[PDB]
Design a protein around this nucleic acid. Structure first.
Ligand SMILES: [Mg+2]
Ligand SMILES: [Mg+2]
Ligand SMILES: [Mg+2]
Ligand SMILES: [Mg+2]
Ligand SMILES: [Mg+2]
Ligand SMILES: [Mg+2]
Ligand SMILES: [Mg+2]
Ligand SMILES: [Mg+2]
Ligand SMILES: [Mg+2]
Ligand SMILES: [Mg+2]
Ligand SMILES: [Mg+2]
Ligand SMILES: [Mg+2]
Ligand SMILES: [Mg+2]
Ligand SMILES: [Mg+2]
Ligand SMILES: [Mg+2]
Ligand SMILES: [Mg+2]
Ligand SMILES: [Mg+2]
Ligand SMILES: [Mg+2]
Ligand SMILES: [Mg+2]
Ligand SMILES: [Mg+2]
Ligand SMILES: [Mg+2]
Ligand SMILES: [Mg+2]
Ligand SMILES: [Mg+2]
Ligand SMILES: [Mg+2]
Ligand SMILES: [Mg+2]
Ligand SMILES: [Mg+2]
Ligand SMILES: [Mg+2]
Ligand SMILES: [Mg+2]
Ligand SMILES: [Mg+2]
Ligand SMILES: [Mg+2]
Ligand SMILES: [Mg+2]
Ligand SMILES: [Mg+2]
Ligand SMILES: [Mg+2]
Ligand SMILES: [Mg+2]
Ligand SMILES: [Mg+2]
Ligand SMILES: [Mg+2]
Ligand SMILES: [Mg+2]
Ligand SMILES: [Mg+2]
Ligand SMILES: [Mg+2]
Ligand SMILES: [Mg+2]
Ligand SMILES: [Mg+2]
Ligand SMILES: [Mg+2]
Ligand SMILES: [Mg+2]
Ligand SMILES: [Mg+2]
Ligand SMILES: [Mg+2]
Ligand SMILES: [Mg+2]
Ligand SMILES: [Mg+2]
Ligand SMILES: [Mg+2]
Ligand SMILES: [Mg+2]
Ligand SMILES: [Mg+2]
Ligand SMILES: [Mg+2]
Ligand SMILES: [Mg+2]
Ligand SMILES: [Mg+2]
Ligand SMILES: [Mg+2]
Ligand SMILES: [Mg+2]
Ligand SMILES: [Mg+2]
Ligand SMILES: [Mg+2]
Ligand SMILES: [Mg+2]
Ligand SMILES: [Mg+2]
Ligand SMILES: [Mg+2]
Ligand SMILES: [Mg+2]
Ligand SMILES: [Mg+2]
Ligand SMILES: [Mg+2]
Ligand SMILES: [Mg+2]
Ligand SMILES: [Mg+2]
Ligand SMILES: [Mg+2]
Ligand SMILES: [Mg+2]
Ligand SMILES: [Mg+2]
Ligand SMILES: [Mg+2]
Ligand SMILES: [Mg+2]
Ligand SMILES: [Mg+2]
Ligand SMILES: [Mg+2]
Ligand SMILES: [Mg+2]
Ligand SMILES: [Mg+2]
Ligand SMILES: [Mg+2]
Ligand SMILES: [Mg+2]
Ligand SMILES: [Mg+2]
Ligand SMILES: [Mg+2]
Ligand SMILES: [Mg+2]
Ligand SMILES: [Mg+2]
Ligand SMILES: [Mg+2]
Ligand SMILES: [Mg+2]
Ligand SMILES: [Mg+2]
Ligand SMILES: [Mg+2]
Ligand SMILES: [Mg+2]
Ligand SMILES: [Mg+2]
Ligand SMILES: [Mg+2]
Ligand SMILES: [Mg+2]
Ligand SMILES: [Mg+2]
Ligand SMILES: [Mg+2]
Ligand SMILES: [Mg+2]
Ligand SMILES: [Mg+2]
Ligand SMILES: [Mg+2]
Ligand SMILES: [Mg+2]
Ligand SMILES: [Mg+2]
Ligand SMILES: [Mg+2]
Ligand SMILES: [Mg+2]
Ligand SMILES: [Mg+2]
Ligand SMILES: [Mg+2]
Ligand SMILES: [Mg+2]
Ligand SMILES: [Mg+2]
Ligand SMILES: [Mg+2]
Ligand SMILES: [Mg+2]
Ligand SMILES: [Mg+2]
Ligand SMILES: [Mg+2]
Lengths: 116, 221, 203, 48, 121
RNA sequence: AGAGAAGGUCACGGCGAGACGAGCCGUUUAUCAUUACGAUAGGUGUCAAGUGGAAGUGCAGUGAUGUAUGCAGCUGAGGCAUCCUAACAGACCCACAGACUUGAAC
RNA sequence: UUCACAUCGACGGGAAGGUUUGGCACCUCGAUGUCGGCUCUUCGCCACCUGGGGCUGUAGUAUGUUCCAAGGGUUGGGCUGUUCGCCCAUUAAAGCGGUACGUGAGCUGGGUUCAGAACGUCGUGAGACAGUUCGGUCCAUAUCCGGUGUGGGCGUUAGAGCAUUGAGAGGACCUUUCCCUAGUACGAGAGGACCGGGAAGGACGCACCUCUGGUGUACCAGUUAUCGUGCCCACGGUAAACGCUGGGUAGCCAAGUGCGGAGCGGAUAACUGCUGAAAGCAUCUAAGUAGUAAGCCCACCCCAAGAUGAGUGCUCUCCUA
RNA sequence: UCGGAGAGAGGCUCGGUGAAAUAGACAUGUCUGUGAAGAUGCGGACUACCUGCACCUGGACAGAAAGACCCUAUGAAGCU
RNA sequence: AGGGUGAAAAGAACCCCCAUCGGGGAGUGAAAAGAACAUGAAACCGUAAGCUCUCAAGCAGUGGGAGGGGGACCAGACC
C-alpha cells in the first residue's frame, strides 16, 4: 500500500506526469484561468505556487530555476514583472479551485483552476 | 476476561532510544497522554450482572458529541470525552463517577504492563504476506509464483474446509502486547516511556493495564 | 408520521366499514368448551359435521394456552421428556392437529436435580461439531450439568419434538430454569400430570 | 469455467434490480446538486 | 551469515587456506552461522605439507562475518571477510597462532582464541 | 396534512482507513485571562532530515581546473506555527408514547 | 549360568486391517486418466522424539520390552522416472499410513514409450520389443456449491447513540543445550543421577521502525551522447516503464527491534494408593475416597446477541394543527 | 536460503459501447448411511436471516467430440 | 434471403414539442389499417392491480387448508 505516499499520479508514468504539470502551469500563467479535470487541478496547485513563490524573490538564481520549469520564456519574464505587485501581501494560496458539471464524453469530474 | 487493576488510555507518540548509565541502549516507545482518564460510570454486580468501571479518555468540543453521549456525561458531571472504555475488575469499591485517575499513582518503575491497541491496516493482503506461505518456484517452467497452492484434497472431501487460510484483509485490529516494562516516567511532560514496540502508528490510541498473569493476578478459572 | 389528511382518515373509516359488514354476516365463533353439536347459525353454514374438523385461528391463539410446571427433581430424564413432548405437541387434547400448534407451554424447574439411571452420569456423551475438520467436542453428562445444566433437558426434549418449521416453533414453548424458581407466576401455571409409573426414582 | 446451468428468471431479475439501484443513489446526488445550483449562492460551483 | 556452501578464510596457522561450511551446530535447526558459533566445515584449499589434507571434515568457530554484530553499547562491527578458526571439540584451537581482529563476544566460550589474538574489539 | 425528532445517509476537505462500500477524522475555523479541548488538506514561514558546497562575481593558473564569498544551494512524503486557498451551497430518510392477555401494586 | 513366559520363542492354531503383489469385471468410456517433486492442507494410530507409568537378566548413566498418550514436532544436502533404497553432516527425533500420484478449470517432471532418428535383438519382408538411446503443444473470463474477507436490506415489537455479558468459534498453550543442586546419592572403580531452581537458544506466533540496513521512477549529486532554450554561461528533453552510476527522508520491509508460551486451577487415561466387604483370610472396588500425564476442560489472545434463545446497561428523542 | 521494495500494462471504481463457450427444469448446505457398489435432490442427525461485491479454485463424476490406448465389424486405407 | 396499408394514396394540410428522426392534436378513411402499416400463437422483455416470502433445506407438486381477497346465483357453492 501507500501510507503517506503523497504525490499526484494523474494515472501517468513519471516523465509524462512531469511534462504534463509543467505544461498546465505555463497555460495557467498565460491565460490566468483554465478548465481541467479535478485531479489535474489539485495536483497542479503545488507547482503553481512553487512558481509564484519563486518569482516573489526575483534573484537571477530563482529566475533560472523558473525558466527551467515553465516552457515559454515570455510568460516567465511577465511573471517576475507582475508578481511583486499583484501578490506581494499574499502569504501563500495563489490559486482558487471551482468545480463544474462533469464532462459529457467520459463523465470525468471537471474543474476550473483560477489564478487568484 | 477479568482484568487485574485499573488501566489508563494514552496516545502513542513514537519511538526513541534511551540510555542507561552503563551504556545499554533501550529502544522505547513514548506514550503521551491527554486531558482525561476520568472514571465515567461504575457497574455493580447487582445492577449490571458484573463489576466494571468505565473510564473516558480524550476530551473534546461539545458540539462534536452526540446528544445521547453528552447526556451520558452530564449524568456523570464530567467534561465531554471522545473514547469511552471499560475495565473489568473483581472488586469495585474504590471508584466513584467523576473521580480522576493519575498514571503516576498506578504505575511505578520496573512494573509490567500490557498494551492493547489497534494495529496498522495493511489492507487486502495475499497468502504470502498474511499467512507466511512459502512461494513456489520463480523459474523452471513454473507458472505459479505467489499463488495460493492447492486449496483442499480431491473428490473426497470435495469441498474446501472452513477456516482454510486465504487472502483477505490484514491488520487494523485490537491487539494485546503482553508483559512490557516501564523504563522512565516524566512528570514534567506527563509521558511514559516503555521498552519495546506497541501497535499502530503515532496518534494512535492505547489502552494500558497492569499485566494479567494467569497464575497470580486472576481468578483461578 | 401518521397523516391525518382527509384521505387517510377516509380510508381507515371505509376499512372499518368493510370490516363491520364482514363481521356481521360471517358465522360466529363458538369456542370448544361444553360446545353443543350446533348453533342455529352454523346450521346455515358449510358442512363441518361430515367433514373432519380442522382448527380455525380463534382456537389456537397463543394467549389462551395452558401453562405447566415440572419439578424435575428426582425425575428420570427421558421418561419425563416424553411426557413433556406429548403436552407441548398437543397430543393429549381431543382437538389435536398435526399441522397446527394446539399444545401447551411447559416450565421445567430444578433442572440440575434431574435424575439419570446407570453409570450414565459419567458415560452419556454430548457431542457437538464445529464444521471444521477435527472440530468434534465431547462432554460427559456431568461436566455439562455443572457448566450449563438447562442444555441437558432442552436437548433431550428437542429430540422428541417434530423436526421442521412447526417443530422449532414448538420448541420455543419449553421454558427451562436451573433454580427452584420461575418468573412466570403471572401465567398461573398448573402442575403437569404424570401417568407413568417408573418416572419417579427413589433411593 | 462455464455456467453448468442457465440462470432462473427470478434470480436474474434480482441481480439486475441491484444494478438498477445505483441509478437511485445517482438520482439523489443529482437532485441535491440541482437544489444547490438553484439558489445561485455557491461560490465553489460554477455553471455557464 | 555463514550458511552451507559458504567459503571462509582461515584465521590461523593450522594449515588450511579455505573452508567450506556445511553445517551449523548447537543452534538446533537455525541456518545461520553468526559470530561465535561452531560450524562443521570441510577443507577446500590447503597449505602444502601440513598436518591438514584437503577434503577433511573439521570443526571451526566463526570469528568474522560480513554481517554486523551488535553489542549493548549500541556498538556495531562489520568485517570485510568471512573467517573461522579450526578447533578441537574441547574449544582449543588446533593451530597455535591467530591472525586478524576478534571481539570480546568470544571471551565466554573460548579463552584460548581471545588470548592468541593480535587485537581485540 | 404541514413541518422536519434524536439520529442516519449524502454533499464538501481529508487520512497512519480503504479494491468498492465500510471506518475514522474534519467542515469557519474560537475565545482565553492559569493548563490541554476550535487548523481537515493544500499553500506560505520556520525546524528536524537529506544531499554535499549553488548560481553570479571575484582572485590563482597557458589551460583543463582550484580557491573565497557560504553547514552554501536545491530538496524537505516528517514536525510546529499562520486562515492565504478549498471545507461554499446545501439536499434526502426520519417523530401511531409504543397491538393483544394476565398477575402484582394503588 | 538355575529359571518356558526379562528378552527370544521352533512345530502348529485363532484373528483384525485393507497400505503391498493379486482374483473378480459391479463401475466409467466422448473430454470419469498412472508415479516424483512444488504449494497447500487435513485425518488415523500399529508412538520415531517430546509428557506420565509397569517389568527387567533395572546398581548408576544408558537400555530392553510393554501400558496410557496423536497436543506439538519430524533437518539440510550427494545420488534416482521411480515406490524402494544408499550414503554425507547433523539432530530431541529425522514415524508409518489414509485423503482419485491427496492436490493437472493450482504449478512442474516423467508416464499413455504418438509422428523423426539410431543401437542390440526377432522377422525373407513391411515392421516389431513391458530392450536401450537423442528429440518431441494442454487449453481456461467461476454459473452454482464450498471457501477468505468485506458491505447493503430486513429483523430484533416506538425510534436511536454509546458501553458491554459471552452461548458458539478460532489462534496459541512447543522444544534443545548449558549452569546450580552435587562430582551429592549409586558403584570396588570407571562413571554419574531422580526431584526442584536458574540462564541462554531453536522453531513458531503477535506486533514494530529507535538503531543496522534493503528499496524508495518524492528528492540531491556526478556523468556520457545529443537536440532545444539566439550564442558563452546555465538549465530543459531524450536515451522505454530512471540514459548510466553514487547517496537518501517519510513509507513498506527483515537479515533489524521488542514481546509471548502463565496456572499447589478442574476432571480423567494408564498406574500407584487408603479405608474395606461379597467368599470370619486376603483384595486399589463392589460403598466411599487420595495422588497423577505435552492429553481433556476452564483460565490466556482475537471474534462474537442473525446467540431469530436476536442479551443487559446508561443516556437521548417523540413536535404543530 | 527467504523473500523485499519500486515502475509500467491489466486487475479494481465511474461514464460510453458491449461479446462468448455453456445451459432438461432448477427453491442448488455439511457429516454419515444408503444406492448401478464415490448423492445439494433418498434416510438420520447437524448446521444454516435475505441478498451483493472482491478474491480462491476442493466439488458439480465442470467445459471444449468419438477414446488416441483395449476389443468388435466377415469395416476403410497404406505397406510387405 | 427479403410477399399481402387501403376499395381508392385519398400516404396525413395546419398548430404544438421541434437541429432531423420521432411524436401529440386536427384532417382522410368503414376502420389509423399511419407506411418497420392486414390475422398476429409461444418463447422472451416488461407495467399495473389482488394475496404472499427475509430461522430457511427444496425435481417444487400433491392430499389436508389457517388467514386474506374476488366475480356470483342454486348464495353450504365457484375462482
Ligand atoms: Mg525517460
Ligand atoms: Mg516516455
Ligand atoms: Mg513544499
Ligand atoms: Mg492502511
Ligand atoms: Mg521455498
Ligand atoms: Mg513467470
Ligand atoms: Mg576425495
Ligand atoms: Mg607481539
Ligand atoms: Mg434532524
Ligand atoms: Mg469523502
Ligand atoms: Mg457511510
Ligand atoms: Mg456548511
Ligand atoms: Mg496545513
Ligand atoms: Mg497536515
Ligand atoms: Mg561557486
Ligand atoms: Mg546542478
Ligand atoms: Mg587567468
Ligand atoms: Mg544538514
Ligand atoms: Mg488562529
Ligand atoms: Mg474561504
Ligand atoms: Mg405499555
Ligand atoms: Mg388493550
Ligand atoms: Mg503364553
Ligand atoms: Mg459391465
Ligand atoms: Mg468433462
Ligand atoms: Mg497406542
Ligand atoms: Mg515416553
Ligand atoms: Mg519405560
Ligand atoms: Mg546395569
Ligand atoms: Mg502426539
Ligand atoms: Mg493433531
Ligand atoms: Mg504428526
Ligand atoms: Mg532427507
Ligand atoms: Mg545430538
Ligand atoms: Mg532428550
Ligand atoms: Mg501424509
Ligand atoms: Mg505426493
Ligand atoms: Mg483438480
Ligand atoms: Mg522422455
Ligand atoms: Mg536379419
Ligand atoms: Mg523379446
Ligand atoms: Mg532441442
Ligand atoms: Mg458469482
Ligand atoms: Mg459463496
Ligand atoms: Mg453478511
Ligand atoms: Mg449486516
Ligand atoms: Mg427496526
Ligand atoms: Mg434496523
Ligand atoms: Mg463515537
Ligand atoms: Mg468485548
Ligand atoms: Mg466460552
Ligand atoms: Mg452460529
Ligand atoms: Mg478454546
Ligand atoms: Mg497450559
Ligand atoms: Mg560419593
Ligand atoms: Mg528441571
Ligand atoms: Mg524462550
Ligand atoms: Mg528503520
Ligand atoms: Mg524513522
Ligand atoms: Mg540505495
Ligand atoms: Mg528507509
Ligand atoms: Mg540552436
Ligand atoms: Mg547546446
Ligand atoms: Mg538532463
Ligand atoms: Mg525531444
Ligand atoms: Mg528509439
Ligand atoms: Mg531500462
Ligand atoms: Mg539510484
Ligand atoms: Mg524476533
Ligand atoms: Mg489436579
Ligand atoms: Mg481419580
Ligand atoms: Mg498396586
Ligand atoms: Mg478384613
Ligand atoms: Mg489394603
Ligand atoms: Mg466405587
Ligand atoms: Mg496438564
Ligand atoms: Mg510447560
Ligand atoms: Mg441487540
Ligand atoms: Mg421470539
Ligand atoms: Mg425473553
Ligand atoms: Mg510486492
Ligand atoms: Mg506495482
Ligand atoms: Mg491496453
Ligand atoms: Mg462499465
Ligand atoms: Mg448464443
Ligand atoms: Mg436456498
Ligand atoms: Mg452399498
Ligand atoms: Mg455417500
Ligand atoms: Mg440429504
Ligand atoms: Mg425432496
Ligand atoms: Mg472448482
Ligand atoms: Mg485462478
Ligand atoms: Mg458434495
Ligand atoms: Mg446432479
Ligand atoms: Mg465375424
Ligand atoms: Mg473385408
Ligand atoms: Mg402527424
Ligand atoms: Mg444542426
Ligand atoms: Mg414528423
Ligand atoms: Mg384525428
Ligand atoms: Mg371521419
Ligand atoms: Mg400485424
Ligand atoms: Mg433457529
Ligand atoms: Mg418467518
Ligand atoms: Mg424454504
Amino acid at each position: 500500500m501507500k501510507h503517506g505516499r503523497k504525490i499526484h499520479r494523474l494515472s501517468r508514468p513519471a516523465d509524462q506526469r512531469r511534462a504534463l504539470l509543467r505544461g498546465l502551469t505555463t497555460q495557467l500563467l498565460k491565460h490566468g484561468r483554465i478548465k481541467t479535470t479535478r485531479a489535474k487541478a489539485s495536483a497542479m496547485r503545488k507547482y503553481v505556487d512553487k512558481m509564484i513563490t519563486l518569482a516573489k524573490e526575483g534573484s537571477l538564481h530563482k529566475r533560472r530555476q523558473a525558466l527551467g520549469f515553465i516552457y515559454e520564456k515570455q510568460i516567465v519574464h511577465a511573471l517576475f514583472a507582475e508578481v511583486p505587485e499583484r501578490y506581494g501581501d499574499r502569504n501563500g494560496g495563489y490559486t482558487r479551485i471551482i468545480r463544474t458539471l462533469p464532462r459529457r464524453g467520459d463523465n470525468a469530474p471537471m474543474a476550473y483552476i483560477e489564478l487568484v | 476476561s477479568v482484568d487485574a487493576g485499573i488501566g489508563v488510555m494514552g496516545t502513542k507518540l513514537g519511538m526513541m532510544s534511551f540510555f542507561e548509565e552503563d551504556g545499554t541502549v533501550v529502544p522505547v516507545t513514548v506514550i503521551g497522554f491527554k486531558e482525561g482518564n476520568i472514571v465515567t460510570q461504575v457497574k455493580t454486580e447487582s445492577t449490571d450482572g458484573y463489576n466494571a468501571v468505565q473510564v473516558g479518555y480524550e476530551r473534546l468540543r461539545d458540539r462534536k458529541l452526540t446528544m445521547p453521549e453528552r447526556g451520558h456525561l452530564n449524568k456523570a458531571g464530567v467534561i465531554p470525552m471522545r473514547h469511552l472504555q471499560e475495565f473489568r475488575l473483581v472488586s469495585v469499591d474504590d471508584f466513584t463517577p467523576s473521580q480522576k485517575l493519575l498514571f503516576e499513582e498506578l504505575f511505578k518503575e520496573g512494573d509490567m504492563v500490557d498494551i492493547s491497541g489497534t494495529t496498522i491496516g495493511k489492507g487486502f493482503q495475499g497468502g504470502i504476506k498474511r499467512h507466511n506461505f512459502k512461494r513456489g518456484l520463480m523459474t523452471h517452467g513454473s507458472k505459479s509464483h505467489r499463488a495460493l497452492g492447492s486449496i483442499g484434497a480431491g473428490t473426497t472431501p470435495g469441498h474446501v474446509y472452513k477456516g482454510k487460510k486465504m487472502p483477505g484483509r490484514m491488520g487494523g485490529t485490537k491487539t494485546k502486547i503482553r508483559k512490557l516494562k516501564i523504563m522512565k516516567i516524566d512528570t514534567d511532560l506527563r509521558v511514559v516511556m516503555i521498552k519495546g514496540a506497541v501497535p499502530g502508528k503515532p496518534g494512535n490510541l492505547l489502552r494500558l493495564a497492569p499485566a494479567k498473569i494467569v497464575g497470580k493476578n486472576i481468578p483461578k478459572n | 408520521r401518521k397523516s391525518t389528511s382527509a384521505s387517510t382518515k377516509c380510508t381507515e373509516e371505509w376499512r372499518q366499514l368493510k370490516e363491520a359488514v364482514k363481521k356481521e354476516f360471517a358465522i360466529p365463533h363458538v369456542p370448544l368448551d361444553q360446545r353443543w353439536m350446533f348453533t342455529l347459525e352454523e346450521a346455515t353454514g358449510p358442512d363441518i359435521w361430515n367433514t373432519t374438523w380442522y382448527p380455525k385461528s380463534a382456537d389456537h391463539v397463543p394467549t389462551d394456552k395452558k401453562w405447566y410446571v415440572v419439578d424435575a427433581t428426582d425425575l428420570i430424564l427421558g421418561r419425563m421428556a416424553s411426557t413433556i413432548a406429548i403436552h407441548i405437541r398437543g397430543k393429549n387434547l381431543a382437538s389435536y392437529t398435526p399441522s397446527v400448534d394446539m399444545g401447551a407451554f411447559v416450565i421445567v424447574v430444578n433442572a440440575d436435580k434431574v435424575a439419570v439411571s446407570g453409570k450414565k452420569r459419567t458415560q452419556k456423551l454430548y457431542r457437538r461439531h464445529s464444521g471444521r475438520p477435527g472440530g468434534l467436542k465431547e462432554e460427559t453428562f456431568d461436566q455439562l450439568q455443572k457448566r450449563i445444566p438447562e442444555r441437558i433437558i432442552e436437548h433431550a426434549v428437542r429430540g422428541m419434538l417434530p423436526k421442521g418449521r412447526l417443530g422449532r416453533y414448538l420448541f420455543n414453548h419449553l421454558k427451562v430454569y436451573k433454580g427452584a424458581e420461575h418468573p412466570h407466576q403471572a401465567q398461573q401455571p398448573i402442575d403437569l400430570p404424570l401417568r407413568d409409573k417408573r418416572i419417579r426414582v427413589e433411593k | 469455467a462455464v455456467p453448468k446451468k442457465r440462470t432462473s428468471i427470478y434470480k436474474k431479475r434480482i441481480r439486475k434490480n441491484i444494478w438498477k439501484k445505483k441509478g437511485y443513489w445517482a438520482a439523489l446526488k443529482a437532485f441535491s446538486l440541482a437544489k444547490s445550483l438553484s439558489t445561485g449562492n455557491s461560490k465553489s460551483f460554477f455553471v455557464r | 551469515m555463514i550458511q552451507p556452501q559458504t567459503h571462509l578464510n582461515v584465521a590461523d596457522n593450522s594449515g588450511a587456506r579455505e573452508l567450506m561450511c556445511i553445517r551449523i551446530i548447537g543452534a538446533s535447526n537455525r541456518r545461520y552461522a553468526r559470530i561465535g558459533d561452531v560450524i562443521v566445515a570441510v577443507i577446500k584449499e590447503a597449505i602444502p605439507n601440513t598436518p591438514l589434507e584437503r577434503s577433511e571434515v573439521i570443526r571451526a568457530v566463526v570469528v568474522r562475518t560480513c554481517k554486523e554484530l551488535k553489542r549493548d553499547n549500541g556498538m556495531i562491527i562489520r568485517y570485510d571477510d568471512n573467517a573461522a578458526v579450526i578447533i578441537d571439540q574441547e574449544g582449543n584451537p588446533k593451530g597455535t597462532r591467530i591472525f586478524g581482529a576478534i571481539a570480546r563476544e568470544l571471551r565466554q566460550k573460548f579463552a584460548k582464541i581471545v588470548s592468541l589474538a593480535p587485537e581485540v574489539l
